[PDB]
């Protein structure tokens, strides 16, 4: 639209005086925009030698006439059907003598009607691409959302597995805890026994010590109770407790089977 009419580097309007040439890649620019062997495009590439570079004929609005290559001021008007291009009257007499021949008017109608068919077909083909572009553009968003969602699905499944596993482990831990404190409360009676026995002995002992230390005119008072001092001394003489030993098996009740843990965690 705004871009075709204008030239290459200068973006000048199609000046026929500018000697504008047309490259194989269909862009157009004046030979004053690019001079230099094989000539390349300002956008595409050096798709062809300079030998296959025709000059753009776009002289808008009195040059409806364009003049032949060879026969000078004899203008091209006629179409050589055997050469796919145009010639003036003379070339058709010399070079194209009895070469299959067409006039502009019928050839232009037929050629416009065939190029319009090619154009409609390629336009209906390029519509499918202007659609498949948005198709893949949305496929990217869907693939990325699904990638993030599978990436999160795996993690949340693993986290749920871990949650239930920690519950089922902490349960057995609390079980061992209950067992241990039950066992300790059962062995606890021995401190009860020791303490009460120590108290009876301490009463008796207190007494004995004071009894001896007072010896000033106390041979009488003392001499009366030897029997019962030795009687509760038989009481504290055979007190009868033997300390048992609760073996430590809490070291061998941790299930340390780690080699199986790693094996089952490898696959998932």
């Amino acid at each position: 639209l705004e871009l075709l009419e204008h030239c290459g580097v200068c973006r000048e309007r199609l000046r026929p005086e500018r000697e504008p040439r047309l490259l194989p890649c269909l862009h157009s620019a004046c030979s004053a925009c690019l001079g230099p062997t094989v000539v390349d495009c300002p956008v595409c590439k050096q798709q062809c030698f300079s030998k296959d570079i025709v000059e753009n004929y776009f002289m808008r609005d009195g040059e409806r006439t364009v003049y032949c290559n060879v026969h000078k001021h004899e203008p091209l008007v006629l179409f050589c059907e055997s050469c796919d291009t145009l010639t003036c009257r003379d070339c058709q007499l010399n070079a194209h003598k009895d070469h299959q021949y067409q006039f502009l008017e019928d050839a232009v109608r037929n050629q416009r009607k065939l190029l319009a068919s090619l154009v409609k077909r390629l336009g209906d083909k390029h519509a499918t691409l202007q659609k498949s572009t948005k198709e893949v553009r949305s496929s990217i968003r869907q693939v990325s959302d699904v990638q993030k969602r599978v990436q999160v699905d795996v993690k949340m499944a693993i986290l749920q597995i871990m949650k239930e596993l920690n519950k089922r482990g902490r349960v057995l831990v609390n079980d061992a805890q209950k067992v241990t404190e039950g066992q300790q409360e059962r062995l606890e009676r021995q401190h009860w026994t020791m303490t009460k026995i120590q108290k009876h002995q301490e009463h008796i002992l207190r007494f004995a010590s004071w009894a001896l230390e007072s010896d000033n005119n106390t041979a009488l008072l003392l001499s009366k109770k030897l029997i019962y001092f030795q009687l509760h001394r038989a009481l504290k003489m055979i007190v009868d407790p033997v300390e048992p030993h609760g073996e430590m098996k809490f070291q061998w009740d941790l299930n340390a089977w780690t080699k199986s843990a790693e094996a089952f965690g490898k696959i998932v």
Partner: protein, 53 residues
Amino acid sequence: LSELEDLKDAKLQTLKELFPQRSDNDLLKLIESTSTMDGAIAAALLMFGDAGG
């Protein structure tokens, strides 16, 4: 057999030391029922009768 008698009487005197309020004839039946274990006797003593220091 005169050794076993003192072996029983020792634990009886110990029970009188622990819980004395309970009569002696009562404690005898229990020291026999336990087959004269040192601590299981104290357990069965907490069972019936007062069970607090």
